[PDB]
Scaffold this active site. Structure first.
Site, PDB file in Angstrom:
ATOM      1  N   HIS A   1       2.308  19.668   8.976  1.00  0.00           N
ATOM      2  CA  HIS A   1       3.612  19.197   8.643  1.00  0.00           C
ATOM      3  C   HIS A   1       4.622  20.645   8.711  1.00  0.00           C
ATOM      4  O   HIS A   1       5.777  20.675   8.649  1.00  0.00           O
ATOM      5  CB  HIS A   1       3.893  18.378   7.240  1.00  0.00           C
ATOM      6  CG  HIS A   1       3.753  19.425   6.083  1.00  0.00           C
ATOM      7  ND1 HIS A   1       2.486  19.329   5.570  1.00  0.00           N
ATOM      8  CD2 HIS A   1       4.628  20.101   5.366  1.00  0.00           C
ATOM      9  CE1 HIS A   1       2.675  20.100   4.313  1.00  0.00           C
ATOM     10  NE2 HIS A   1       3.735  20.617   4.262  1.00  0.00           N
TER      11      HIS A   1
ATOM     12  N   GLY B   1       6.331  25.486  -0.815  1.00  0.00           N
ATOM     13  CA  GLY B   1       5.693  26.792  -0.143  1.00  0.00           C
ATOM     14  C   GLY B   1       4.535  26.713  -0.436  1.00  0.00           C
ATOM     15  O   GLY B   1       3.816  27.737   0.375  1.00  0.00           O
TER      16      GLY B   1
ATOM     17  N   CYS C   1       2.001  24.805   0.245  1.00  0.00           N
ATOM     18  CA  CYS C   1       1.234  24.175   1.451  1.00  0.00           C
ATOM     19  C   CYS C   1       0.428  25.181   2.306  1.00  0.00           C
ATOM     20  O   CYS C   1       0.945  26.147   2.552  1.00  0.00           O
ATOM     21  CB  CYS C   1       2.036  23.176   2.049  1.00  0.00           C
ATOM     22  SG  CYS C   1       3.117  22.028   1.328  1.00  0.00           S
TER      23      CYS C   1
HETATM   24  C1  LIG Z   1       6.985  20.366  -3.329  1.00  0.00           C
HETATM   25  C2  LIG Z   1       5.621  20.691  -3.465  1.00  0.00           C
HETATM   26  C3  LIG Z   1       4.933  20.812  -4.688  1.00  0.00           C
HETATM   27  C4  LIG Z   1       3.623  20.891  -4.641  1.00  0.00           C
HETATM   28  N1  LIG Z   1       2.742  20.891  -3.579  1.00  0.00           N
HETATM   29  C5  LIG Z   1       3.278  20.523  -2.455  1.00  0.00           C
HETATM   30  C6  LIG Z   1       4.900  20.552  -2.339  1.00  0.00           C
HETATM   31  N2  LIG Z   1       5.263  20.291  -0.997  1.00  0.00           N
HETATM   32  C7  LIG Z   1       5.308  19.184  -0.558  1.00  0.00           C
HETATM   33  O1  LIG Z   1       4.931  17.955  -1.026  1.00  0.00           O
HETATM   34  C8  LIG Z   1       5.852  18.930   0.841  1.00  0.00           C
HETATM   35  N3  LIG Z   1       6.520  17.801   1.063  1.00  0.00           N
HETATM   36  C9  LIG Z   1       7.521  17.200   0.556  1.00  0.00           C
HETATM   37  O2  LIG Z   1       8.215  18.088  -0.576  1.00  0.00           O
HETATM   38  C10 LIG Z   1       8.001  15.855   0.354  1.00  0.00           C
HETATM   39  O3  LIG Z   1       7.610  14.976   1.624  1.00  0.00           O
HETATM   40  C11 LIG Z   1       6.498  15.393   2.207  1.00  0.00           C
HETATM   41  C12 LIG Z   1       5.389  14.562   2.945  1.00  0.00           C
HETATM   42  C13 LIG Z   1       4.313  14.961   3.386  1.00  0.00           C
HETATM   43  C14 LIG Z   1       3.764  16.124   2.867  1.00  0.00           C
HETATM   44 CL1  LIG Z   1       2.085  16.399   3.877  1.00  0.00          CL
HETATM   45  C15 LIG Z   1       4.563  17.127   2.565  1.00  0.00           C
HETATM   46  C16 LIG Z   1       5.779  16.747   1.701  1.00  0.00           C
END
Ligand SMILES: Cc1ccncc1NC(=O)CN1C(=O)COc2ccc(Cl)cc21
Ligand SMILES: Cc1ccncc1NC(=O)CN1C(=O)COc2ccc(Cl)cc21
Lengths: 304, 304
Positions: free
Chosen positions: B41, B143, B145
């Site tokens: 992503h 961030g 990820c």
């Molecule tokens: C914010 C955060 C906090 C903790 N751990 C990870 C994150 N970030 C995410 O989750 C990124 N992300 C979104 O913010 C929304 O849409 C998505 C759909 C699919 C996938 Cl793979 C990632 C996302």
């Protein structure tokens, strides 16, 4: 989101760990620049530990009696000296992996990470607080002596603790990196009173703010309190009295959540008086005090 | 003595962390040999995330669009490919700090350490379990990820997890290092059901053994139970049914303490039915399930 008991990345400290052997005793040492720091009880046998005369025991030792090994390689010892309860072994080679570092004496109630080591090899890392009575509730076994506690500010490692002993009660005691014990402890095999401990109130309040930031808010109530009233409750439940300096340190968390410090104190007052009624806060069924307000801000902002 | 939620030393993994930028998205990557692994992503914008066509989005990208930076220095990307939900960026330089490593797919109920990173910089390390429903209760922000989960067997790092997303419920989901999600999750911004979770019974029993080893024994009783009877109680309290394979894995702990597994099951049965009556076990007021029987043995023996 989510909130965990997180330790600092241990890489910079792993690079400093060495094994120190003197006679039949092996423990861990910390190699920074051309000096290896380790507990002075490395010079004792088990027979010596009831009341060791360290000055006399050290006079029987020469540089070549201190075997220092950095993983695979042997370090050449060119000097030795005792400073309080630590030995400083001067070596002919500066550690090439020496990070930017400081030696600090931490205050009770502050937190730090411990890299538990055996025979100079790191085994694991965990976060903990220095209790108000200057003991630490660690996870240490025989051979862990010399393992260190530290904090990291970007690229600087501030070493604050060196592990020396387990008290007969199962709790842990150690020194700053100048070899001064935290608390009333001495490096001798004797029963030793650790003072009355208390719960670190400012850290519990910081952790209730971490809970709200992360969506756990069932404990918030319609009440407020005063420092005086809250301190009568803190007294009864063996919590440290809250001061204006603690309220000041909680300012950033109060600003982020919009919950006034005294209102959070009223939630903590109700939790002390009523318990948690079978509920949890951030996965805990008790009031957690091992996170400082700085730790919560760091964890909730993503500082590297 | 003492028992802590201990993570593996993170040094070997810190040496592998890089920042990966594609367009306006920056996340973490894992640099092992001449390949950098990161969540696919990284190629999406926020607009793309509702239902991204990854194949089409990746066709618009060339090697030079993937900016990979190992702290200070820039890596030259000479190939890119998508494997399940991960991108593999071939670079012209093998990571000089690549440890001995393996890619493993862990089983639900197993534990691992996470090195949380932001912009390719490590921020902290914590231990956690892969829940029975294939989610992890981590501490991750935007961030994070690309941060990885791993275990270490002496000098070998077995990477088991790469962080991808936070579900609308605040829990975390990710993939193995081949990019296959753990659980039913997809890398798309949609509400996604995480299955019914359960408590990892074998780990709670392992932790009760850790408690006895460390002197917390108030919960031991005069009773015993059978697997069938215990499983009726496990059923009621949403605990995983105990099998003979779990009893077998608890053999070493039963041997060390002399407490038969079914007798420990009877202590756990009484704790489920009666609660802890305001008492604690190893500093916890709930039944802990994030320690495997291997973790307890490792921590109680001092493995490095
Ligand atoms: C914010 C955060 C906090 C903790 N751990 C990870 C994150 N970030 C995410 O989750 C990124 N992300 C979104 O913010 C929304 O849409 C998505 C759909 C699919 C996938 Cl793979 C990632 C996302
Ligand atoms: C066994 C263990 C577990 C956890 N942390 C440390 C240890 N080790 C020790 O405490 C070593 N040691 C004794 O075993 C007894 O006598 C002493 C007197 C003074 C001093 Cl400094 C050390 C000792």
């Amino acid at each position: 989101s989510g909130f965990r008991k997180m330790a600092f990345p241990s890489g910079k400290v792993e690079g400093c760990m060495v094994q120190v052997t003197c006679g039949t005793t092996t423990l861990n040492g910390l190699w920074l620049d051309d000096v290896v720091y380790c507990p002075r009880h490395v010079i004792c046998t088990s027979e010596d530990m009831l009341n060791p005369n360290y000055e006399d025991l050290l006079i029987r030792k020469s540089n070549h009696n201190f075997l220092v090994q950095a993983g695979n390689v042997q370090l050449r010892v060119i000097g030795h000296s005792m400073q309080n309860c630590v030995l400083k072994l001067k070596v002919d080679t500066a550690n090439p992996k020496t990070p930017k570092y400081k030696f600090v004496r931490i205050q009770p109630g502050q937190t730090f990470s411990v890299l538990a080591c055996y025979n100079g090899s790191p085994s694991g890392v965990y976060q903990c607080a220095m209790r108000p009575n200057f003991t630490i509730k660690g996870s240490f076994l025989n051979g862990s002596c010399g393992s260190v506690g530290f904090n990291i500010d970007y690229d600087c490692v501030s070493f604050c603790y060196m592990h020396h002993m387990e008290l007969p009660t199962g709790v842990h005691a150690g020194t700053d990196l100048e070899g001064n014990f935290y608390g009333p402890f001495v490096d001798r095999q004797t029963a030793q009173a650790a003072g009355t401990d208390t719960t670190i109130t400012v850290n519990v309040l910081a952790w209730l703010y971490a809970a709200v930031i992360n969506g756990d808010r069932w404990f918030l109530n319609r009440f407020t309190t005063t420092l005086n009233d809250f301190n009568l409750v803190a007294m009864k439940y063996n919590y440290e009295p809250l001061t204006q300096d603690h309220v000041d340190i909680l300012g950033p968390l109060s600003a982020q959540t919009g919950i006034a410090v005294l209102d959070m104190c009223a939630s903590l007052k109700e939790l002390l008086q009523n318990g948690m009624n079978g509920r949890t806060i951030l996965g805990s069924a008790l009031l957690e005090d091992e996170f400082t307000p700085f730790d919560v801000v760091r964890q909730c902002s993503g500082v590297t």
